[PDB]
Design a protein around this ligand. Structure first.
Ligand SMILES: Nc1ccccc1Nc1nc2ccccc2[nH]1
Ligand code: NI
Length: 341
């Protein structure tokens, strides 16, 4: 059965609720972004209206084969009316096509659902400026102060400098980047740009990137692996075994691999700064783990919520344990007492 935190009260609406069959009373199903935990249960044979961004709609149509008659794409930063209720989609600063949703209830209640987001001070000058919000449905992935990590800009700088140094020392090195979903495209695009190369990949991954409305994308990516010295592979292949196997298929064009594994937060972030990071190495193969997060850090989350001053917060992540729920509730109270709302 559909849990309470996926339902919007006073409406016929659900958010990211496709894995419970037909939800009784649901007139419109919203999808915040094309990540598998959120779209789980959507397939070719789904027959109810789906509301989403244009990019999410392209992926539904082309990758999951949902019929076009059930896909309702909406523009960003624009007042739209769905089943007689005013809604606005906002960029979530997550993966391509990811949105937050504002619902203006007939009775005057205002609800913000963040989907998955990486909070940023630029959101304080969106359409949210001076907007009363009664309920906030919040991406609480990293709601604890131990969760620290650098800016995306800092992480990209490290990656670009590392790749450029390695290939300048050895022009016959190949660069490989792991992927298992959309998001984090800046990692491989920034590296390929500094190296003067297109990014090479499978037909399936090419299809996925062609749905994302990235400007000038045809100039940046290719299925011709032989023409490229930055390759994408599944994240599961980024290990010494999988990279040794990949190198053997490249026809003696390369004699070294430098590989990147984009992660979220990991335990090493407690101890070792991005500037000090080193790779794991075996022979002519090196692997860097880089913490490129598309979720709020604890401090980013805290600033956004203290600025917004919501009357009630409903977490949407880490909801399944009493320990997690208690910890989150204690921080929300702390934040409220500190800021005076
Ligand atoms: N590329 C080359 C060709 C002829 C003679 C020397 C070099 N320099 C070099 N530096 C490396 C650093 C790591 C791996 C391979 C490397 N090759
Ligand atoms: Ni996500």
């Amino acid at each position: 059965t559909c849990p309470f935190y996926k339902k919007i009260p006073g409406t016929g609406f659900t958010v990211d609720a496709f894995q419970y069959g037909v939800v009784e009373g649901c007139t419109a199903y919203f999808l915040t972004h094309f990540h598998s935990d959120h779209y789980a249960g959507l397939s070719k044979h789904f027959t109810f209206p789906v509301y989403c961004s244009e990019i999410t709609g392209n992926l539904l149509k082309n990758k999951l084969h949902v019929q076009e008659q059930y896909i309702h794409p909406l523009p960003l930063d624009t007042e739209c009316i769905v089943n007689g209720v005013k809604v606005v989609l906002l960029d979530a600063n997550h993966c391509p096509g990811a949105v937050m949703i504002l619902f203006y209830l007939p009775n005057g209640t205002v609800i913000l659902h963040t989907g998955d987001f990486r909070a940023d001070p630029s959101m304080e000058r969106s359409l949210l400026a001076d907007q009363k919000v009664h309920m906030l449905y919040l991406d609480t992935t990293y709601c604890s102060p131990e969760y620290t990590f650098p800016s995306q800009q800092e992480v990209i700088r490290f990656a670009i400098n590392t790749a450029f140094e390695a290939v300048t020392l050895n022009p016959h090195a190949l660069v490989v980047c792991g992927t298992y979903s959309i998001g984090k495209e800046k990692v491989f695009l920034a590296i390929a740009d500094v190296l003067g190369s297109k990014v090479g990949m499978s037909q399936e991954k090419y299809k996925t990137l062609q749905c994302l409305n990235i400007p000038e994308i045809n100039s940046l990516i290719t299925t011709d692996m032989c023409s490229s010295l930055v390759h994408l592979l599944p994240m599961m292949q980024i290990n010494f075994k999988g990279l040794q196997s990949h190198l053997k298929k490249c026809g003696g064009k390369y004699n070294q691999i430098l590989a990147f594994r984009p992660t979220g937060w990991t335990h090493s972030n407690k101890f070792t700064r991005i500037a000090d990071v080193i790779p794991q190495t075996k022979g002519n193969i090196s692997i860097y783990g880089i913490p490129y997060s598309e979720h709020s850090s604890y401090l980013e989350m805290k600033r956004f919520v203290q600025w917004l001053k919501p009357q009630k917060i409903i977490p949407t992540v880490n909801v399944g344990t009493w320990k997690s729920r208690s910890t989150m509730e204690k921080y929300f109270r702390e934040w409220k007492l500190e800021a005076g709302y």
